Design a binder for these strands. Structure first.
Lengths: 71, 71, 71, 70, 71
DNA sequence: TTTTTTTTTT
């Protein structure tokens, strides 16, 4: 992944231990991140064009899965 | 088809491959979009006046159909 | 209380006086800060790189909890 | 009013006609300034250490309340 | 209007072509100068007590409006 | 002259 802030992009992936991190940020995920969930996240934010650090992007991904899976 | 964010408008349409996209975002559609579902979505969001990129609109349409057809 | 501006770092804590100050600043919290809320706050601002006085860091944490918990 | 350039301090207060000043400077305030809003402001800038004239401090409070109430 | 350096005073105004100047100095004002922004600028600098040439005052206004409207 | 973290018709 790039250093510093950057816009979301198609082959981006969170860290292997992403679920661990999400737990540490108060989001307990039962099942792993599916290819579809990630593709949808990336599409949305790639369009938006805002820029963030890798770890902030992962925080956005966790918050998004939490809302996504409540429904 | 405008570039950038835009408010929804009456002759708006999702891409021709919309059904495959929806699948890639984790929305499996067994029926194609109807002119009535699309008019309903457009009328709602046109009034609202909120602005989004084309791809984000298409995600809103996918989510909206999922919910709508579940009922 | 720590002195001078400083970047956010992993072991940072707002003092035991934090809930008190938050109330003096118009943010009334029912329950204490969770390890997770804090971890999440730290991760975000540590990546951001910005530098602040302790009290200022505390106000940002208060504002964040207020928003966070409104959901 | 406090004189010269100065650092923010606990007992600081804007003028009684602060509301109308804020309007003159393009910040239309529906309600008056609360105790907590002021304590929050004062804490922030007291830590920061920067020094300003009283009126400038009042302009900073006006800009801040605007942002804060949105 | 006064020649040479002078302290800011309540009735001060910039030139009628102030928008064109501001563009020459790199500040493109999508909107012109409001009476309020002006009073705000005057109260600030009148308090500050510094003296400047008319054209220097006009540069301070222009830089100011740039920063003030960047929000 | 510079205080202001935030995907979801239901």
């Amino acid at each position: 992944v790039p250093m510093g802030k950057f816009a979301m992009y198609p082959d981006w992936q969170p860290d292997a231990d992403f679920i661990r991190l999400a737990a540490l940020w108060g989001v307990a995920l039962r099942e792993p991140v599916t290819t579809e969930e990630l593709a949808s996240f990336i599409a949305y934010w790639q369009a938006e064009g805002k820029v963030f650090h890798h770890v902030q992007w992962q925080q956005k991904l966790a918050r998004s899965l939490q809302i996504g899976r409540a429904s």
